[PDB]
Amino acid sequence: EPHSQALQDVEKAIMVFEHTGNIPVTVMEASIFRRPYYVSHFLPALLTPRVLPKVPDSRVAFIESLKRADKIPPSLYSTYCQACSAEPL
Amino acid sequence: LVFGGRTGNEDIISRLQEMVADLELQQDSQEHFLFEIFRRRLQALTSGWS
Amino acid sequence: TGNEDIISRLQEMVADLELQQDLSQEHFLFEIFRRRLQALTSGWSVAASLQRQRELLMYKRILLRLPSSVLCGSSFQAEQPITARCEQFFHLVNSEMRNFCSHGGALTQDITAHFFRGLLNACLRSRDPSLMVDFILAKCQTKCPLILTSALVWWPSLEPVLL
DSSP: OTTHHHHHHHHHHHHHHHHSSSOOHHHHHHHHHOHHHHHHHHHHHHOOOSOOOSSOOHHHHHHHHHHTTTOSOHHHHHHHHHHHHOOOO | OOOOOOOOOSHHHHHHHHHHHHHHHHHOOOOOHHHHHHHHHHHHSOOOOO | OOOTTHHHHHHHHHHHHHHHHHOOOOOHHHHHHHHHHHHSOOOOOHHHHHHHHHHHHHHHHHHHHSOTHHHHOSOOOSSSSOOSSHHHHHHHIIIIITTSSOSSSOOOHHHHHHHHHHHHHHHHHSSSHHHHHHHHHHHHHHHOHHHHHHHHHTHHHHHHHHO
Protein backbone atom coordinates (compact mmCIF):
# COMPACT_ATOMS: atom_id res chain seq x y z
CA GLU A 1 0.00 0.00 0.00
CA PRO A 2 2.78 2.57 0.76
CA HIS A 3 4.10 1.60 -2.72
CA SER A 4 0.90 1.73 -4.83
CA GLN A 5 -0.45 4.91 -3.16
CA ALA A 6 2.93 6.68 -3.49
CA LEU A 7 2.60 6.20 -7.29
CA GLN A 8 -0.71 8.14 -7.29
CA ASP A 9 0.84 10.76 -4.96
CA VAL A 10 3.90 11.51 -7.15
CA GLU A 11 1.51 11.37 -10.15
CA LYS A 12 -0.65 14.25 -8.89
CA ALA A 13 2.54 16.00 -7.67
CA ILE A 14 4.08 16.15 -11.16
CA MET A 15 0.64 16.98 -12.65
CA VAL A 16 0.25 20.11 -10.50
CA PHE A 17 3.97 20.86 -11.08
CA GLU A 18 3.06 21.07 -14.78
CA HIS A 19 -0.13 23.10 -14.22
CA THR A 20 1.90 25.34 -11.88
CA GLY A 21 5.67 25.65 -11.96
CA ASN A 22 8.41 25.01 -9.41
CA ILE A 23 7.53 22.42 -6.74
CA PRO A 24 4.00 22.59 -5.29
CA VAL A 25 4.12 23.01 -1.53
CA THR A 26 1.96 20.12 -0.27
CA VAL A 27 4.74 17.54 -0.82
CA MET A 28 7.14 20.05 0.80
CA GLU A 29 4.95 19.86 3.94
CA ALA A 30 5.19 16.05 4.29
CA SER A 31 8.92 16.20 3.33
CA ILE A 32 10.28 17.98 6.43
CA PHE A 33 7.62 16.92 8.99
CA ARG A 34 6.71 13.35 7.88
CA ARG A 35 10.06 11.68 7.16
CA PRO A 36 8.74 8.05 7.17
CA TYR A 37 6.06 8.88 4.57
CA TYR A 38 8.60 11.17 2.84
CA VAL A 39 10.98 8.24 2.18
CA SER A 40 8.11 5.77 1.57
CA HIS A 41 6.78 8.08 -1.19
CA PHE A 42 10.21 9.19 -2.47
CA LEU A 43 10.95 5.64 -3.75
CA PRO A 44 8.58 5.74 -6.80
CA ALA A 45 9.83 9.31 -7.39
CA LEU A 46 13.10 7.60 -8.49
CA LEU A 47 12.00 4.06 -9.54
CA THR A 48 12.21 4.75 -13.29
CA PRO A 49 14.18 1.91 -14.92
CA ARG A 50 13.60 3.50 -18.34
CA VAL A 51 15.67 5.27 -20.99
CA LEU A 52 15.88 9.07 -20.86
CA PRO A 53 14.56 11.18 -23.76
CA LYS A 54 17.08 13.39 -25.56
CA VAL A 55 15.22 16.51 -24.33
CA PRO A 56 14.06 17.03 -20.72
CA ASP A 57 10.44 16.27 -19.78
CA SER A 58 8.08 16.52 -16.79
CA ARG A 59 9.65 13.71 -14.71
CA VAL A 60 13.28 14.84 -15.00
CA ALA A 61 12.38 18.56 -14.70
CA PHE A 62 10.47 17.70 -11.51
CA ILE A 63 13.54 15.85 -10.19
CA GLU A 64 15.84 18.80 -11.07
CA SER A 65 13.52 21.28 -9.32
CA LEU A 66 13.67 18.91 -6.32
CA LYS A 67 17.48 18.52 -6.21
CA ARG A 68 18.22 22.29 -6.20
CA ALA A 69 16.41 22.42 -2.82
CA ASP A 70 19.45 20.48 -1.40
CA LYS A 71 17.14 17.55 -0.50
CA ILE A 72 17.32 14.11 -2.18
CA PRO A 73 20.46 12.55 -0.60
CA PRO A 74 22.86 11.77 -3.47
CA SER A 75 22.80 8.00 -2.72
CA LEU A 76 19.25 7.64 -4.08
CA TYR A 77 20.25 9.96 -6.97
CA SER A 78 23.19 7.66 -7.86
CA THR A 79 20.85 4.63 -7.73
CA TYR A 80 18.42 6.62 -9.93
CA CYS A 81 20.97 7.44 -12.66
CA GLN A 82 22.53 3.94 -12.70
CA ALA A 83 19.02 2.38 -12.93
CA CYS A 84 18.13 4.69 -15.86
CA SER A 85 21.50 3.71 -17.42
CA ALA A 86 20.18 0.12 -17.85
CA GLU A 87 8.46 -31.54 -29.62
CA PRO A 88 5.16 -30.56 -27.89
CA LEU A 89 4.99 -27.38 -30.03
CA LEU B 1 5.24 6.09 -15.85
CA VAL B 2 3.60 9.53 -15.71
CA PHE B 3 6.11 11.31 -18.02
CA GLY B 4 3.78 14.33 -18.07
CA GLY B 5 0.17 15.16 -18.78
CA ARG B 6 -1.65 15.21 -22.11
CA THR B 7 -3.30 18.58 -22.80
CA GLY B 8 -5.71 17.17 -25.39
CA ASN B 9 -7.95 20.19 -26.00
CA GLU B 10 -7.53 23.95 -26.07
CA ASP B 11 -10.58 24.16 -28.37
CA ILE B 12 -13.52 23.28 -26.08
CA ILE B 13 -12.55 26.14 -23.75
CA SER B 14 -12.55 28.42 -26.83
CA ARG B 15 -16.09 27.07 -27.42
CA LEU B 16 -17.04 27.96 -23.83
CA GLN B 17 -15.68 31.43 -24.71
CA GLU B 18 -18.51 32.07 -27.18
CA MET B 19 -21.07 30.17 -25.04
CA VAL B 20 -20.57 32.41 -21.99
CA ALA B 21 -19.98 35.52 -24.14
CA ASP B 22 -23.44 34.94 -25.69
CA LEU B 23 -24.96 34.26 -22.24
CA GLU B 24 -23.49 37.56 -20.95
CA LEU B 25 -25.26 39.68 -23.59
CA GLN B 26 -28.31 37.41 -23.06
CA GLN B 27 -28.86 37.90 -19.31
CA ASP B 28 -28.84 41.74 -19.15
CA SER B 29 -28.95 41.37 -10.17
CA GLN B 30 -28.75 37.54 -10.24
CA GLU B 31 -25.61 35.52 -9.45
CA HIS B 32 -23.66 33.37 -11.91
CA PHE B 33 -24.12 29.58 -11.87
CA LEU B 34 -20.40 28.94 -12.61
CA PHE B 35 -19.50 29.73 -8.99
CA GLU B 36 -22.39 27.50 -7.83
CA ILE B 37 -21.15 24.44 -9.78
CA PHE B 38 -17.66 25.39 -8.54
CA ARG B 39 -18.77 25.19 -4.89
CA ARG B 40 -20.54 21.90 -5.71
CA ARG B 41 -17.29 20.42 -7.08
CA LEU B 42 -15.43 21.72 -4.00
CA GLN B 43 -17.85 20.26 -1.41
CA ALA B 44 -17.86 16.99 -3.40
CA LEU B 45 -14.05 16.86 -2.96
CA THR B 46 -12.58 14.80 -0.10
CA SER B 47 -12.27 16.93 3.06
CA GLY B 48 -9.37 14.69 4.22
CA TRP B 49 -5.86 15.96 4.99
CA SER B 50 -3.59 13.66 2.96
CA THR C 1 -4.43 24.87 -36.98
CA GLY C 2 -1.74 27.06 -35.41
CA ASN C 3 -3.41 29.96 -33.60
CA GLU C 4 -6.18 29.06 -31.18
CA ASP C 5 -4.61 31.99 -29.28
CA ILE C 6 -4.72 34.73 -31.96
CA ILE C 7 -8.46 34.09 -32.43
CA SER C 8 -8.70 34.58 -28.65
CA ARG C 9 -6.83 37.90 -29.07
CA LEU C 10 -9.52 38.80 -31.64
CA GLN C 11 -12.27 38.03 -29.08
CA GLU C 12 -10.46 40.41 -26.70
CA MET C 13 -10.17 43.27 -29.20
CA VAL C 14 -13.76 42.86 -30.50
CA ALA C 15 -15.31 42.95 -27.01
CA ASP C 16 -13.10 46.01 -26.31
CA LEU C 17 -14.38 47.82 -29.42
CA GLU C 18 -17.98 46.69 -28.63
CA LEU C 19 -17.96 48.65 -25.31
CA GLN C 20 -16.13 51.57 -27.06
CA GLN C 21 -18.81 51.65 -29.84
CA ASP C 22 -21.57 51.55 -27.12
CA LEU C 23 -19.91 54.62 -25.46
CA SER C 24 -25.22 54.01 -35.20
CA GLN C 25 -21.83 53.70 -36.94
CA GLU C 26 -20.82 50.72 -39.07
CA HIS C 27 -18.11 48.17 -38.24
CA PHE C 28 -14.70 48.37 -39.94
CA LEU C 29 -14.50 44.57 -40.41
CA PHE C 30 -17.04 44.51 -43.25
CA GLU C 31 -15.06 47.30 -44.96
CA ILE C 32 -11.89 45.16 -44.64
CA PHE C 33 -13.85 42.23 -46.14
CA ARG C 34 -15.01 44.48 -48.99
CA ARG C 35 -11.42 45.70 -49.56
CA ARG C 36 -10.00 42.17 -49.79
CA LEU C 37 -12.85 41.03 -52.07
CA GLN C 38 -12.11 44.01 -54.36
CA ALA C 39 -8.34 43.36 -54.32
CA LEU C 40 -9.00 39.76 -55.37
CA THR C 41 -8.54 39.07 -59.10
CA SER C 42 -11.74 40.08 -60.94
CA GLY C 43 -11.20 37.17 -63.39
CA TRP C 44 -13.62 34.28 -64.00
CA SER C 45 -10.85 31.61 -63.99
CA VAL C 46 -11.83 28.65 -61.77
CA ALA C 47 -8.65 29.51 -59.82
CA ALA C 48 -10.26 32.87 -58.96
CA SER C 49 -13.65 31.29 -58.10
CA LEU C 50 -11.99 28.75 -55.75
CA GLN C 51 -9.79 31.48 -54.18
CA ARG C 52 -12.92 33.61 -53.56
CA GLN C 53 -14.70 30.55 -52.09
CA ARG C 54 -11.74 29.82 -49.78
CA GLU C 55 -11.73 33.48 -48.69
CA LEU C 56 -15.49 33.55 -48.00
CA LEU C 57 -15.47 30.34 -45.92
CA MET C 58 -12.61 31.94 -43.91
CA TYR C 59 -14.79 35.05 -43.44
CA LYS C 60 -17.66 32.80 -42.31
CA ARG C 61 -15.32 31.06 -39.84
CA ILE C 62 -14.04 34.35 -38.37
CA LEU C 63 -17.56 35.82 -38.06
CA LEU C 64 -18.77 32.64 -36.30
CA ARG C 65 -15.85 32.96 -33.87
CA LEU C 66 -16.59 36.58 -32.86
CA PRO C 67 -19.90 37.19 -31.07
CA SER C 68 -23.22 37.72 -32.84
CA SER C 69 -23.27 41.35 -31.57
CA VAL C 70 -20.93 42.37 -34.44
CA LEU C 71 -23.58 41.55 -37.08
CA CYS C 72 -26.80 43.09 -35.73
CA GLY C 73 -25.14 45.54 -33.36
CA SER C 74 -26.90 45.75 -30.01
CA SER C 75 -29.75 47.88 -28.61
CA PHE C 76 -31.65 49.44 -31.54
CA GLN C 77 -32.60 52.56 -29.58
CA ALA C 78 -35.45 54.14 -31.59
CA GLU C 79 -37.22 53.62 -34.91
CA GLN C 80 -35.24 56.23 -36.91
CA PRO C 81 -31.79 54.96 -35.77
CA ILE C 82 -32.45 51.41 -37.01
CA THR C 83 -30.67 49.05 -39.43
CA ALA C 84 -27.08 50.20 -38.75
CA ARG C 85 -24.42 47.61 -39.76
CA CYS C 86 -27.38 45.36 -40.72
CA GLU C 87 -27.44 46.84 -44.26
CA GLN C 88 -23.65 46.28 -44.40
CA PHE C 89 -24.18 42.62 -43.53
CA PHE C 90 -27.07 42.26 -46.00
CA HIS C 91 -24.89 43.78 -48.75
CA LEU C 92 -22.19 41.23 -47.92
CA VAL C 93 -24.71 38.32 -47.83
CA ASN C 94 -26.14 39.41 -51.20
CA SER C 95 -22.92 40.20 -53.08
CA GLU C 96 -20.83 37.26 -51.85
CA MET C 97 -22.30 34.58 -49.53
CA ARG C 98 -25.09 33.51 -51.93
CA ASN C 99 -22.43 32.45 -54.45
CA PHE C 100 -20.20 30.28 -52.23
CA CYS C 101 -21.51 29.92 -48.63
CA SER C 102 -24.87 28.56 -49.87
CA HIS C 103 -26.52 25.28 -50.91
CA GLY C 104 -30.05 24.82 -52.28
CA GLY C 105 -30.54 28.59 -52.50
CA ALA C 106 -30.10 28.71 -48.70
CA LEU C 107 -27.33 29.72 -46.29
CA THR C 108 -25.46 27.57 -43.76
CA GLN C 109 -26.94 26.66 -40.36
CA ASP C 110 -23.93 28.33 -38.70
CA ILE C 111 -24.33 31.97 -39.77
CA THR C 112 -28.14 31.70 -39.80
CA ALA C 113 -28.20 30.79 -36.10
CA HIS C 114 -25.42 33.31 -35.30
CA PHE C 115 -27.49 36.01 -37.04
CA PHE C 116 -30.91 35.16 -35.52
CA ARG C 117 -29.26 34.95 -32.08
CA GLY C 118 -27.75 38.45 -32.42
CA LEU C 119 -31.19 39.63 -33.60
CA LEU C 120 -33.15 38.19 -30.66
CA ASN C 121 -30.37 39.45 -28.34
CA ALA C 122 -30.50 43.06 -29.58
CA CYS C 123 -34.33 43.10 -29.83
CA LEU C 124 -34.94 41.86 -26.25
CA ARG C 125 -32.18 44.26 -25.15
CA SER C 126 -34.18 46.98 -26.94
CA ARG C 127 -37.69 48.19 -26.08
CA ASP C 128 -40.81 47.25 -28.07
CA PRO C 129 -39.06 44.00 -29.06
CA SER C 130 -41.89 42.11 -30.87
CA LEU C 131 -42.65 45.09 -33.16
CA MET C 132 -38.96 45.73 -33.94
CA VAL C 133 -38.40 42.03 -34.75
CA ASP C 134 -41.38 42.18 -37.13
CA PHE C 135 -39.93 45.40 -38.61
CA ILE C 136 -36.45 43.96 -39.26
CA LEU C 137 -37.85 40.68 -40.65
CA ALA C 138 -40.18 42.68 -42.94
CA LYS C 139 -37.23 44.73 -44.25
CA CYS C 140 -35.29 41.47 -44.78
CA GLN C 141 -37.91 40.66 -47.46
CA THR C 142 -36.58 43.75 -49.32
CA LYS C 143 -32.84 43.86 -48.47
CA CYS C 144 -31.75 40.24 -47.75
CA PRO C 145 -34.42 37.59 -48.44
CA LEU C 146 -31.90 34.71 -48.36
CA ILE C 147 -31.99 34.96 -44.56
CA LEU C 148 -35.71 34.19 -44.54
CA THR C 149 -35.14 31.36 -47.05
CA SER C 150 -32.40 30.14 -44.70
CA ALA C 151 -34.66 30.46 -41.68
CA LEU C 152 -37.04 28.38 -43.80
CA VAL C 153 -34.46 25.53 -43.98
CA TRP C 154 -32.96 25.77 -40.46
CA TRP C 155 -36.29 26.20 -38.64
CA PRO C 156 -36.43 22.88 -36.69
CA SER C 157 -32.88 23.85 -35.63
CA LEU C 158 -33.53 27.43 -34.48
CA GLU C 159 -37.03 27.28 -32.94
CA PRO C 160 -35.93 25.51 -29.68
CA VAL C 161 -33.11 28.06 -29.19
CA LEU C 162 -35.28 31.10 -29.94
CA LEU C 163 -38.31 29.99 -27.85
